Design a protein around this nucleic acid. Structure first.
Ligand code: ZN
Length: 355
DNA sequence: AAATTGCCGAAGACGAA
DNA sequence: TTTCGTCTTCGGCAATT
Protein backbone atom coordinates (compact mmCIF):
# COMPACT_ATOMS: atom_id res chain seq x y z
CA UNK A 1 0.00 0.00 0.00
CA UNK A 2 2.57 2.58 1.11
CA UNK A 3 4.99 1.11 -1.44
CA UNK A 4 2.52 1.93 -4.23
CA UNK A 5 2.08 5.48 -2.92
CA UNK A 6 5.84 6.05 -3.09
CA UNK A 7 5.85 4.91 -6.72
CA UNK A 8 3.19 7.52 -7.47
CA UNK A 9 5.18 10.19 -5.64
CA UNK A 10 8.44 9.28 -7.37
CA UNK A 11 9.71 11.97 -9.74
CA UNK A 12 10.03 11.20 -13.46
CA UNK A 13 13.43 11.62 -15.10
CA UNK A 14 11.88 13.32 -18.14
CA UNK A 15 10.20 15.86 -15.84
CA UNK A 16 13.41 16.41 -13.87
CA UNK A 17 15.49 17.02 -16.99
CA UNK A 18 13.05 19.51 -18.54
CA UNK A 19 12.58 21.39 -15.27
CA UNK A 20 16.24 21.53 -14.20
CA UNK A 21 17.32 22.68 -17.66
CA UNK A 22 15.18 25.81 -17.48
CA UNK A 23 15.78 26.51 -13.78
CA UNK A 24 19.57 26.29 -14.14
CA UNK A 25 19.45 28.66 -17.09
CA UNK A 26 17.58 31.28 -15.09
CA UNK A 27 19.47 30.96 -11.81
CA UNK A 28 22.98 31.17 -13.32
CA UNK A 29 22.08 34.30 -15.32
CA UNK A 30 20.65 35.91 -12.19
CA UNK A 31 23.68 34.87 -10.15
CA UNK A 32 25.90 36.37 -12.86
CA UNK A 33 24.03 39.69 -12.99
CA UNK A 34 24.46 39.91 -9.21
CA UNK A 35 28.24 39.63 -9.80
CA UNK A 36 28.78 42.58 -12.17
CA UNK A 37 30.48 45.67 -10.70
CA UNK A 38 28.77 48.44 -8.72
CA UNK A 39 26.59 45.74 -7.14
CA UNK A 40 26.34 45.51 -3.36
CA UNK A 41 25.86 41.75 -3.72
CA UNK A 42 28.99 41.25 -5.82
CA UNK A 43 30.39 38.40 -3.71
CA UNK A 44 27.27 36.24 -3.47
CA UNK A 45 27.56 32.49 -4.07
CA UNK A 46 24.99 29.82 -4.87
CA UNK A 47 23.89 27.04 -2.53
CA UNK A 48 21.03 24.80 -3.65
CA UNK A 49 18.71 23.72 -0.83
CA UNK A 50 15.26 22.33 -0.11
CA UNK A 51 13.36 19.14 -0.94
CA UNK A 52 14.47 18.77 -4.57
CA UNK A 53 18.19 18.90 -3.75
CA UNK A 54 17.66 16.58 -0.78
CA UNK A 55 15.88 14.11 -3.09
CA UNK A 56 12.72 14.23 -0.97
CA UNK A 57 10.67 16.23 -3.46
CA UNK A 58 7.39 14.49 -4.30
CA UNK A 59 5.00 14.27 -7.28
CA UNK A 60 6.63 16.84 -9.57
CA UNK A 61 9.86 18.89 -9.82
CA UNK A 62 7.99 22.21 -9.70
CA UNK A 63 9.54 23.85 -6.63
CA UNK A 64 13.20 24.85 -6.30
CA UNK A 65 14.99 26.61 -3.44
CA UNK A 66 18.20 28.53 -4.11
CA UNK A 67 20.26 30.41 -1.54
CA UNK A 68 22.28 33.43 -2.64
CA UNK A 69 24.67 33.73 0.29
CA UNK A 70 26.70 36.84 1.07
CA UNK A 71 29.88 36.62 3.15
CA UNK A 72 29.61 39.16 5.99
CA UNK A 73 32.80 39.30 8.11
CA UNK A 74 33.17 41.26 11.36
CA UNK A 75 29.58 40.52 12.36
CA UNK A 76 28.00 41.20 15.76
CA UNK A 77 24.80 39.35 16.64
CA UNK A 78 22.17 40.41 19.15
CA UNK A 79 19.49 37.88 20.09
CA UNK A 80 15.97 39.24 19.70
CA UNK A 81 14.49 38.77 23.19
CA UNK A 82 14.68 35.11 24.27
CA UNK A 83 13.74 33.66 20.89
CA UNK A 84 17.04 32.05 19.91
CA UNK A 85 16.18 32.02 16.21
CA UNK A 86 15.80 35.75 15.61
CA UNK A 87 18.67 38.24 15.73
CA UNK A 88 19.68 41.81 14.97
CA UNK A 89 22.83 42.28 12.89
CA UNK A 90 25.42 44.89 13.89
CA UNK A 91 28.73 45.70 12.19
CA UNK A 92 31.98 46.38 14.01
CA UNK A 93 33.65 49.23 8.96
CA UNK A 94 34.14 52.29 6.71
CA UNK A 95 33.67 51.66 2.98
CA UNK A 96 31.22 48.78 3.34
CA UNK A 97 29.29 47.68 0.21
CA UNK A 98 26.19 47.37 2.43
CA UNK A 99 26.74 50.67 4.24
CA UNK A 100 23.68 52.05 2.47
CA UNK A 101 21.63 49.26 4.04
CA UNK A 102 22.67 50.34 7.53
CA UNK A 103 20.52 52.21 10.03
CA UNK A 104 23.34 53.37 12.27
CA UNK A 105 25.14 50.13 13.12
CA UNK A 106 22.06 47.98 12.54
CA UNK A 107 21.76 46.09 9.26
CA UNK A 108 18.31 46.47 7.70
CA UNK A 109 16.96 43.27 6.17
CA UNK A 110 14.13 45.23 4.52
CA UNK A 111 16.45 47.66 2.73
CA UNK A 112 18.86 44.94 1.61
CA UNK A 113 16.10 42.61 0.43
CA UNK A 114 14.51 45.54 -1.40
CA UNK A 115 17.60 46.25 -3.51
CA UNK A 116 18.12 42.50 -3.94
CA UNK A 117 14.60 42.17 -5.37
CA UNK A 118 15.11 45.25 -7.55
CA UNK A 119 18.20 43.76 -9.21
CA UNK A 120 16.53 40.40 -9.86
CA UNK A 121 13.39 42.08 -11.20
CA UNK A 122 15.46 44.13 -13.66
CA UNK A 123 17.33 41.09 -14.95
CA UNK A 124 14.17 38.99 -15.24
CA UNK A 125 12.56 41.50 -17.62
CA UNK A 126 15.61 41.07 -19.87
CA UNK A 127 14.91 37.35 -20.21
CA UNK A 128 13.23 36.71 -23.57
CA UNK A 129 13.84 32.99 -24.14
CA UNK A 130 12.01 31.80 -21.03
CA UNK A 131 8.54 32.69 -19.70
CA UNK A 132 9.58 33.90 -16.24
CA UNK A 133 8.06 36.47 -13.88
CA UNK A 134 8.74 37.73 -10.35
CA UNK A 135 5.98 37.03 -7.84
CA UNK A 136 4.83 39.91 -5.61
CA UNK A 137 6.57 40.11 -2.23
CA UNK A 138 4.88 37.77 0.25
CA UNK A 139 4.79 38.51 4.02
CA UNK A 140 7.07 36.27 6.07
CA UNK A 141 9.11 35.27 3.02
CA UNK A 142 12.90 35.83 2.83
CA UNK A 143 12.88 34.99 -0.87
CA UNK A 144 12.35 36.56 -4.27
CA UNK A 145 10.05 34.01 -5.88
CA UNK A 146 10.23 33.33 -9.61
CA UNK A 147 7.32 31.93 -11.60
CA UNK A 148 8.35 29.92 -14.65
CA UNK A 149 6.00 28.65 -17.35
CA UNK A 150 7.91 25.70 -18.84
CA UNK A 151 4.87 25.51 -19.90
CA UNK A 152 4.42 23.66 -16.60
CA UNK A 153 4.40 26.04 -13.64
CA UNK A 154 7.65 26.09 -11.68
CA UNK A 155 8.45 28.18 -8.61
CA UNK A 156 12.01 29.18 -7.76
CA UNK A 157 12.66 30.70 -4.33
CA UNK A 158 15.83 32.80 -4.46
CA UNK A 159 16.73 33.27 -0.81
CA UNK A 160 19.01 36.10 0.29
CA UNK A 161 21.30 34.94 3.09
CA UNK A 162 24.13 36.36 5.18
CA UNK A 163 27.08 34.00 5.64
CA UNK A 164 29.02 34.08 8.90
CA UNK A 165 32.06 31.84 9.42
CA UNK A 166 32.40 32.24 13.18
CA UNK A 167 31.07 29.90 15.87
CA UNK A 168 27.33 29.20 15.79
CA UNK A 169 25.14 31.35 18.11
CA UNK A 170 24.92 30.12 21.70
CA UNK A 171 21.23 29.26 21.27
CA UNK A 172 22.34 26.33 19.09
CA UNK A 173 24.86 24.94 21.61
CA UNK A 174 22.60 22.13 22.86
CA UNK A 175 21.02 21.65 19.44
CA UNK A 176 21.85 19.14 16.69
CA UNK A 177 21.74 16.15 19.08
CA UNK A 178 23.32 13.68 16.64
CA UNK A 179 25.96 12.29 19.04
CA UNK A 180 24.51 8.78 19.26
CA UNK A 181 23.42 8.82 15.62
CA UNK A 182 25.94 10.49 13.28
CA UNK A 183 28.58 11.00 15.95
CA UNK A 184 30.72 13.70 17.56
CA UNK A 185 33.19 14.13 14.68
CA UNK A 186 30.31 14.74 12.26
CA UNK A 187 28.62 17.20 14.66
CA UNK A 188 31.86 19.09 15.27
CA UNK A 189 32.58 19.28 11.53
CA UNK A 190 29.05 20.45 10.78
CA UNK A 191 29.32 23.24 13.34
CA UNK A 192 32.62 24.38 11.83
CA UNK A 193 30.69 25.13 8.74
CA UNK A 194 29.19 28.60 8.37
CA UNK A 195 25.85 29.59 9.70
CA UNK A 196 23.29 31.55 7.80
CA UNK A 197 20.95 34.41 8.40
CA UNK A 198 17.93 35.20 6.27
CA UNK A 199 15.44 38.11 6.51
CA UNK A 200 12.45 37.27 8.71
CA UNK A 201 10.48 39.88 6.74
CA UNK A 202 7.22 40.06 8.72
CA UNK A 203 4.66 42.80 8.03
CA UNK A 204 2.75 42.59 11.32
CA UNK A 205 4.12 46.01 12.27
CA UNK A 206 5.97 44.72 15.33
CA UNK A 207 9.18 46.29 16.65
CA UNK A 208 12.43 45.67 14.73
CA UNK A 209 10.46 44.09 11.86
CA UNK A 210 12.66 45.57 9.18
CA UNK A 211 15.80 44.52 10.85
CA UNK A 212 15.18 41.08 12.28
CA UNK A 213 17.08 38.15 10.79
CA UNK A 214 16.45 34.45 11.37
CA UNK A 215 18.83 31.49 11.48
CA UNK A 216 18.83 29.04 8.57
CA UNK A 217 20.38 25.57 8.67
CA UNK A 218 19.25 24.41 5.22
CA UNK A 219 22.84 23.46 4.33
CA UNK A 220 23.28 21.30 7.43
CA UNK A 221 19.89 19.68 6.85
CA UNK A 222 20.91 18.92 3.26
CA UNK A 223 24.11 17.18 4.41
CA UNK A 224 22.21 15.21 7.04
CA UNK A 225 19.70 14.01 4.44
CA UNK A 226 22.57 12.83 2.22
CA UNK A 227 24.47 11.32 5.15
CA UNK A 228 21.70 9.98 7.36
CA UNK A 229 22.85 6.51 8.39
CA UNK A 230 24.67 5.40 11.50
CA UNK A 231 26.59 3.15 9.12
CA UNK A 232 28.64 4.97 6.50
CA UNK A 233 27.36 2.67 3.74
CA UNK A 234 23.66 3.37 4.36
CA UNK A 235 21.84 3.62 1.00
CA UNK A 236 25.19 3.32 -0.84
CA UNK A 237 25.95 0.90 -3.69
CA UNK A 238 27.84 -1.46 -1.37
CA UNK A 239 25.44 -0.93 1.53
CA UNK A 240 21.81 -1.49 2.46
CA UNK A 241 18.83 0.73 1.67
CA UNK A 242 16.87 2.26 4.54
CA UNK A 243 13.39 3.80 4.57
CA UNK A 244 14.23 7.11 6.28
CA UNK A 245 13.66 9.34 3.24
CA UNK A 246 10.47 7.59 2.12
CA UNK A 247 8.90 8.01 5.57
CA UNK A 248 9.64 11.70 5.16
CA UNK A 249 8.10 11.66 1.68
CA UNK A 250 4.97 9.89 2.94
CA UNK A 251 4.58 12.30 5.85
CA UNK A 252 5.12 15.30 3.57
CA UNK A 253 2.43 13.94 1.25
CA UNK A 254 -0.07 13.33 4.05
CA UNK A 255 0.28 16.93 5.25
CA UNK A 256 0.06 18.49 1.78
CA UNK A 257 -3.09 16.58 0.82
CA UNK A 258 -4.61 17.66 4.13
CA UNK A 259 -3.52 21.29 3.73
CA UNK A 260 -5.09 21.42 0.26
CA UNK A 261 -8.73 21.16 1.34
CA UNK A 262 -8.50 22.53 4.89
CA UNK A 263 -7.72 26.21 5.46
CA UNK A 264 -7.60 25.41 9.18
CA UNK A 265 -4.38 23.53 8.47
CA UNK A 266 -2.70 26.75 7.39
CA UNK A 267 0.32 27.83 9.46
CA UNK A 268 1.42 24.20 9.24
CA UNK A 269 4.24 23.39 6.83
CA UNK A 270 6.67 20.75 5.62
CA UNK A 271 9.34 21.99 8.04
CA UNK A 272 7.25 20.78 10.98
CA UNK A 273 7.25 17.31 9.45
CA UNK A 274 10.96 17.55 8.63
CA UNK A 275 11.80 18.64 12.18
CA UNK A 276 9.76 15.77 13.62
CA UNK A 277 11.57 13.06 11.65
CA UNK A 278 14.95 14.53 12.62
CA UNK A 279 14.00 13.99 16.26
CA UNK A 280 12.76 10.55 15.26
CA UNK A 281 16.07 9.72 13.55
CA UNK A 282 17.76 10.78 16.78
CA UNK A 283 15.63 8.57 19.01
CA UNK A 284 15.97 5.60 16.62
CA UNK A 285 19.57 5.93 15.32
CA UNK A 286 20.10 2.34 14.11
CA UNK A 287 19.76 1.74 10.36
CA UNK A 288 18.08 -1.57 11.24
CA UNK A 289 15.31 0.48 12.86
CA UNK A 290 14.64 1.84 9.37
CA UNK A 291 14.56 -1.32 7.26
CA UNK A 292 12.48 -1.09 4.04
CA UNK A 293 10.71 -4.30 5.10
CA UNK A 294 9.29 -2.35 8.04
CA UNK A 295 8.09 0.73 6.13
CA UNK A 296 4.55 0.48 7.53
CA UNK A 297 5.67 0.34 11.17
CA UNK A 298 8.30 3.04 10.61
CA UNK A 299 5.72 5.41 9.13
CA UNK A 300 3.24 4.64 11.90
CA UNK A 301 5.67 5.48 14.71
CA UNK A 302 6.50 8.75 12.94
CA UNK A 303 2.79 9.54 12.98
CA UNK A 304 2.57 8.61 16.66
CA UNK A 305 5.52 10.86 17.45
CA UNK A 306 3.97 13.72 15.49
CA UNK A 307 0.59 13.28 17.18
CA UNK A 308 2.25 13.41 20.60
CA UNK A 309 3.95 16.64 19.53
CA UNK A 310 0.52 18.13 18.80
CA UNK A 311 -0.98 16.86 22.06
CA UNK A 312 1.75 18.37 24.22
CA UNK A 313 2.07 21.41 21.94
CA UNK A 314 5.83 20.85 21.77
CA UNK A 315 8.03 20.57 18.68
CA UNK A 316 11.52 21.85 19.41
CA UNK A 317 13.55 23.27 16.53
CA UNK A 318 16.20 20.63 15.86
CA UNK A 319 19.00 23.20 15.87
CA UNK A 320 17.53 25.62 18.42
CA UNK A 321 16.05 23.77 21.45
CA UNK A 322 14.50 26.97 22.87
CA UNK A 323 12.40 27.51 19.75
CA UNK A 324 9.08 25.66 20.04
CA UNK A 325 7.47 25.25 16.62
CA UNK A 326 4.21 24.27 18.32
CA UNK A 327 3.87 27.11 20.83
CA UNK A 328 0.55 28.77 21.61
CA UNK A 329 2.04 31.62 19.62
CA UNK A 330 2.53 30.76 15.92
CA UNK A 331 -0.09 27.99 16.09
CA UNK A 332 -3.45 28.16 17.88
CA UNK A 333 -4.61 25.20 19.99
CA UNK A 334 -7.68 24.79 17.77
CA UNK A 335 -5.36 24.09 14.83
CA UNK A 336 -3.39 21.30 16.51
CA UNK A 337 -6.60 19.58 17.62
CA UNK A 338 -7.93 19.78 14.06
CA UNK A 339 -4.79 18.31 12.48
CA UNK A 340 -4.76 15.62 15.15
CA UNK A 341 -8.41 15.02 14.29
CA UNK A 342 -7.51 14.48 10.63
CA UNK A 343 -4.34 12.43 11.10
CA UNK A 344 -5.76 9.61 13.25
CA UNK A 345 -8.73 9.41 10.87
CA UNK A 346 -6.36 8.81 7.95
CA UNK A 347 -4.25 6.57 10.17
CA UNK A 348 -7.20 4.38 11.19
CA UNK A 349 -8.94 4.21 7.81
CA UNK A 350 -5.96 2.98 5.80
CA UNK A 351 -5.17 6.47 4.49
CA UNK A 352 -8.03 7.17 2.05
CA UNK A 353 -6.62 10.63 1.28
CA UNK A 354 -3.65 8.99 -0.48
CA UNK A 355 -6.11 8.20 -3.28
C1' DA B 1 40.30 34.70 -12.10
C1' DA B 2 35.58 33.59 -13.80
C1' DA B 3 33.97 29.45 -15.12
C1' DT B 4 35.35 25.06 -17.32
C1' DT B 5 36.94 20.57 -15.94
C1' DG B 6 36.99 15.72 -13.84
C1' DC B 7 34.77 12.57 -11.16
C1' DC B 8 31.20 9.60 -9.22
C1' DG B 9 27.25 9.27 -5.74
C1' DA B 10 22.08 9.26 -5.78
C1' DA B 11 18.56 7.57 -7.88
C1' DG B 12 15.20 7.03 -12.16
C1' DA B 13 14.28 3.40 -16.04
C1' DC B 14 14.24 -1.05 -17.70
C1' DG B 15 14.84 -5.72 -17.41
C1' DA B 16 16.15 -10.91 -16.38
C1' DA B 17 16.66 -14.30 -12.30
C1' DT C 1 4.99 -10.10 -6.74
C1' DT C 2 8.94 -7.69 -6.94
C1' DT C 3 13.89 -6.20 -6.16
C1' DC C 4 18.80 -6.69 -7.99
C1' DG C 5 21.72 -5.30 -11.51
C1' DT C 6 23.04 -2.31 -15.18
C1' DC C 7 22.65 1.88 -17.64
C1' DT C 8 21.47 6.46 -17.34
C1' DT C 9 21.35 11.80 -16.02
C1' DC C 10 21.75 15.40 -12.49
C1' DG C 11 24.22 17.52 -8.92
C1' DG C 12 28.26 18.84 -5.78
C1' DC C 13 32.73 19.99 -5.03
C1' DA C 14 37.29 22.07 -5.93
C1' DA C 15 41.24 21.88 -9.13
C1' DT C 16 42.18 23.88 -13.04
C1' DT C 17 42.99 27.31 -16.88
ZN1 ZN D 1 19.84 5.13 4.22
Amino acid sequence: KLKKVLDKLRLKRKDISEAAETVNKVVERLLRRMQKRESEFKGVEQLNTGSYYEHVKISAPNEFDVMFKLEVPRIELQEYYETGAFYLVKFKPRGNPLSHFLEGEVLSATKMLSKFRKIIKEEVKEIKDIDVSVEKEKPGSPAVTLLIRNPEEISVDIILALESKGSWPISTKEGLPIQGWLGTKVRTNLRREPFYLVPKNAKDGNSFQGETWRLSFSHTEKYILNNHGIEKTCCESSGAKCCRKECLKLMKYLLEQLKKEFQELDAFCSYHVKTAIFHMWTQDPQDSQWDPRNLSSCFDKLLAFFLECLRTEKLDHYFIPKFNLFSQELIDRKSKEFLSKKIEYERNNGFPIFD
